[PDB]
Amino acid sequence: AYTNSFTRGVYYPDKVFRSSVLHSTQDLFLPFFSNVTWFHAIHRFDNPVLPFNDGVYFASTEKSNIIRGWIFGTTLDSKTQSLLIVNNATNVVIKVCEFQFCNDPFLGVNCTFEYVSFKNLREFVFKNIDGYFKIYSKHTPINLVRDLPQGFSALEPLVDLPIGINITRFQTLLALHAAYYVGYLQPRTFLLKYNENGTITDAVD
Amino acid sequence: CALDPLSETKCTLKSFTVEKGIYQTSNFRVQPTESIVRFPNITNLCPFGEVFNATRFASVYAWNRKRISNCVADYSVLYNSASFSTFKCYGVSPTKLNDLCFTNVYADSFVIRGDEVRQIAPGQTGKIADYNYKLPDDFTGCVIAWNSNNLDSKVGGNYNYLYRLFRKSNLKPFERDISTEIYQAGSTPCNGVEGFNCYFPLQSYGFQPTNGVGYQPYRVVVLSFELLHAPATVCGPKKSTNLVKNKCVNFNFNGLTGTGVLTESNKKFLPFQQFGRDIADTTDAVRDPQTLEILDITPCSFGGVSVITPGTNTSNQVAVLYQDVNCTEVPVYSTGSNVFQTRAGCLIGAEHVNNSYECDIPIGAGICASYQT
Amino acid sequence: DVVMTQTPASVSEPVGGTVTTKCQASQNIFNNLAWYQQKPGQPPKLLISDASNLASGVSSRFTGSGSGTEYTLTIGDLECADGATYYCQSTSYGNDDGAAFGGGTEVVV
Amino acid sequence: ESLEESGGGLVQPGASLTLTCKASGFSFSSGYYMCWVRQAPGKGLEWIACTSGGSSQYTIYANWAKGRSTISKTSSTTVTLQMTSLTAADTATYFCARGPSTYYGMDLWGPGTLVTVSS
Ligand SMILES: *[C@@H]1O[C@H](CO)[C@@H](O)[C@H](O)[C@H]1NC(C)=O
Ligand SMILES: *[C@@H]1O[C@H](CO)[C@@H](O)[C@H](O)[C@H]1NC(C)=O
Ligand SMILES: *[C@@H]1O[C@H](CO)[C@@H](O)[C@H](O)[C@H]1NC(C)=O
Ligand SMILES: *[C@@H]1O[C@H](CO)[C@@H](O)[C@H](O)[C@H]1NC(C)=O
Ligand SMILES: *[C@@H]1O[C@H](CO)[C@@H](O)[C@H](O)[C@H]1NC(C)=O
Ligand SMILES: *[C@@H]1O[C@H](CO)[C@@H](O)[C@H](O)[C@H]1NC(C)=O
Ligand SMILES: *[C@@H]1O[C@H](CO)[C@@H](O)[C@H](O)[C@H]1NC(C)=O
Ligand SMILES: *[C@@H]1O[C@H](CO)[C@@H](O)[C@H](O)[C@H]1NC(C)=O
Ligand SMILES: *[C@@H]1O[C@H](CO)[C@@H](O)[C@H](O)[C@H]1NC(C)=O
């Protein structure tokens, strides 16, 4: 099952501030009205393996926060060093340690780098450029439970950790005692409309 | 060509007679007053506070070993502390230790009585140095010990601290051995712990507050260093010079390295954003990394320098118009008695007159200068 | 290199009195000071080290105190043989702080 | 123990001089520093340089004589120090003193030698 991402998937390309300026940037983005992939997790139903291919846009709408973390690695089966992010209520954990995981690892209800920091829809972009791993996030409320709604919402950077490990494959975690969308980025020039306050209110491909 | 504005006009015109009018001769330019670098605050400050003011140090024979790397080691806290009385340290000056950058740091922390505090030094021989902890001859570390009689010693003598007094050989530089093999001597029949010429190599000395200062325990830490044979991971802090506003100063905020005047800006910034740019891709506002506020930057005042003069035959008196600049920063001309300000610029050497006549030497923005009685 | 400023240049005290000599540094030395007595025609002799410790064969009359940047040397019960020049010197051998002496201070009985 | 100096005396202005200190009864271990000090005929002591003993080659120069002195350990019992571009102000008495690695004061001072820079 697929869906089409109307306008979502745009982030601030850099920490530069601009006011009332239409600024054109050539960067890795998610195309407008592009078909992105749907996944189910209720009822069985499991999460499959995904590639990276120059960045991932991940948008999960949740009620009880089934999503619990991400795995980014070429192999991530204890073969080579792999980035691991685990989101717990206590704190967010980022490791590079090698771990062996089965085909369908479920969660009950050497390390090189480390970091510690359906009404709800969590939007994210994870990218790897110039050896830098970048995260952009938003948590706008959605009143539509069928699909992501028509509209726009900019994405704000949260972490710029230099992991330095090439990623060509990615997996998500779920909780077992819930659909989510995955898009794809590629170089596509955008024209972003900066507000008087610096917020990106509109963008054109 | 530099004596006075009339001479500058003559040089630019390449003629010894200058006709009545306004002639642009040179370019005004305000040089930066100074340089300010407001670098951000500490990225990863792992201190030696817990290493030094620890709950209890380890025994001298098996000392507390710590590795310091991938940090910003603040040596200033150690430098400012006057409680240290045996700062017997080599290779680096205490004041320049912050500037010095090393790949690795080793912390060897233990307790030593005042009698053998001397023995904690390279090239020194003694029972404690040769049995518990020895320093290398090529010692680049930093030895710091301070009094702890009020903390370590207890009533009736303290026995939680153990040291080795008997050993057949001497410890090689930076060697730890907790095996504590039984000491043997003479005919060596001592299979157990006690025998002829046999004693336990480990022992404990009662530490008392009323004991002599030489026998009083001191807390001692050795900061072993090493040369730059690799990219450095632990280093010192950076500069935190002050900020100056309403003055043309070269500034460095988070590597911006821009030159201009700084003012408080009414424009708002998003928390992640650190600086702003114009429609022409030129920086116009910077968020200060040290303190979160916005500073509007505008380029150093500059503009043409024009000489307004009548015919050199009529008179040799001239006026100077600095185009598009306010007279406050113009001096950064000799005839400072009258200095008038107009939209065209700052005019020096001419007096304003309420009366209006036909234009003779246009200046700009509806103002003309003329030579009259 | 740290510099030693030793005052007063010349002092005069009667027999049995006390004479105090002040030594100041440009940076913090953390003790590591040595007080010396030099008689004319004789190489300097050590009196006090570590700014508080007295060596063997040194009378208890000599006493050094102070910490940080300011140091003091006092000599009690002055004797006829005590007439000499006293010096203060940092003992930083391989610390880049140097071991420069201060201005010599002669004493008059 | 004892310390002795040799190689001093009259030196022509603008020339170079070499001074050697020889020890008797001990060796230049890594726990002792060989230091050099000078004394003007009517002035106080002026420190020159030091060199760590043992296998260490660490050496510290003074600010005034950073480029005009060369101190190095030739042997476990003998040390040498060289002056360059001698002037009349360098006429002084050189003392060879040892300094323990514990950073105590200098003990066992040498008798000293006089060097005169004149023609
Ligand atoms: C989405 O677009 C892709 C690429 O053109 C296409 O293969 C796919 O069939 C589309 N999905 C739907 C549901 O139309
Ligand atoms: C971490 O991962 C592997 C696991 O086999 C280990 O052998 C290797 O030395 C480590 N790599 C780095 C770069 O530290
Ligand atoms: C990208 O992955 C390849 C393996 O296909 C690896 O050789 C290369 O070093 C990686 N590049 C970076 C920047 O990590
Ligand atoms: C811009 O100004 C404030 C800044 O907080 C913001 O709340 C307001 O909604 C913004 N105005 C518009 C028209 O978007
Ligand atoms: C350190 O930098 C931070 C940056 O947020 C600033 O708020 C703070 O005042 C600075 N100084 C101290 C002593 O924390
Ligand atoms: C911790 O140790 C440091 C060593 O520099 C000292 O300055 C500081 O006062 C100590 N802290 C307390 C709370 O005693
Ligand atoms: C200046 O005026 C004088 C007298 O009025 C005249 O002779 C001369 O030619 C004039 N010079 C110029 C350059 O016009
Ligand atoms: C300089 O002139 C400008 C332009 O008229 C004026 O707004 C400003 O207040 C003046 N600045 C100073 C420092 O007097
Ligand atoms: C021109 O008029 C002003 C009032 O606007 C008057 O005060 C002033 O004297 C006149 N200017 C000069 C330079 O005399």
Q: Select from A84, A97, A110, A112 the residue to mutate for testing ligand 2; criterion: most ligand atoms less than 8 Å from CB.
A: A110
Closest residue by Cα to atom 1, ligand 1, is A35
Q: What is the resolution of this structure in A?
A: 3.3
Pair B218, B117: CB distance under 8 Å: yes
Closest residue by Cα to atom 6, ligand 7, is B313
Closest atom, ligand 9, to C-alpha of B352: 13
Query: Which string of DSSP letters, residue by residue, matches B142-201?
Result: EEEEEE-TTTT--TT---S--EE---SS-PPSS------PPP--TT----SSSBTTB--S
Task: Give the strand order in the sheet containing A120-129.
Answer: A2-5, A34-39, A180-184, A56-62, A120-129, A132-138, A156-159
Greatest Cα pair distance, chain B, in angstroms, is: 126
Chain D contact set for B137 (CB, 8 A): 30, 54-56
Min distance C82 CA to chain B CA atoms (Å): 30
Pair D92, D38: CB distance under 8 Å: yes
Cα–Cα dist D41/C107, whole Å = 18
How many CA atoms does the CB half-sphere of A35 hold within 13 Å?
2
Cα–Cα dist B362/B344, whole Å = 10
Closest atom, ligand 6, to C-alpha of B52: 2
Report the DSSP pairing between strands D9-11 and D113-117. Answer: parallel
How many CA atoms does the CB half-sphere of C105 hold within 13 Å?
28
Outline where chain B has alpha helix (H). 5-13, 49-52, 76-80, 127-131
Cα–Cα dist A88/A80, whole Å = 25
- A17 and B273 within 8 Å at the Cβ level: the answer is yes
Q: How was this structure determined?
A: cryo-EM
Cβ pairs bridging A and B (under 8 Å):
34
Min distance A80 CA to chain B CA atoms (Å): 23
Give yes or no for B79 touching C (CB within 8 A).
Answer: yes
- D99 and C85 within 8 Å at the Cβ level: the answer is no
Pull the structure tokens for residue A107: 């969660």
Closest residue by Cα to atom 7, ligand 4, is A197
Cβ pairs bridging C and D (under 8 Å):
84
Please name each of the domains of chain A with its CATH number.
1-205 (2.60.120.960)
- D52 and C99 within 8 Å at the Cβ level: the answer is no
Residue D117's DSSP bridge partners are: D11
Pull the structure tokens for residue D6: 């040799």
Cα–Cα dist D18/D7, whole Å = 6
Q: Which of D115, D94, D95, D113 is closest to D15 using CA atoms?
A: D115
Q: Nearest ligand to the C-alpha of residue A75?
A: 3
Cα–Cα dist B321/B326, whole Å = 11
Min distance C64 CA to chain D CA atoms (Å): 13
Q: Which of C30, C40, C39, C38 is closest to C2 using CA atoms?
A: C30
Pull the structure tokens for residue B277: 């740019």
Pull the structure tokens for residue D16: 């170079």
Q: Nearest 5°: CA angle at B178, between B175 and B179?
A: 115
Chain C contact set for D104 (CB, 8 A): 34, 49-50, 53, 91
Which residues have CB under 8 Å from C60's CB, separation 6+?
A: C54
The Å distance, Cα B39 to ligand 3 centre, comes to 34
With an 8 Å CB cutoff and a minimum of 3 pairs, decide whether chains D and A touch: no
Which among D46, D95, D99 has CB closest to C43? D95
Which among A16, A156, A157 has CB closest to B277? A16
Cα–Cα dist A11/B24, whole Å = 50
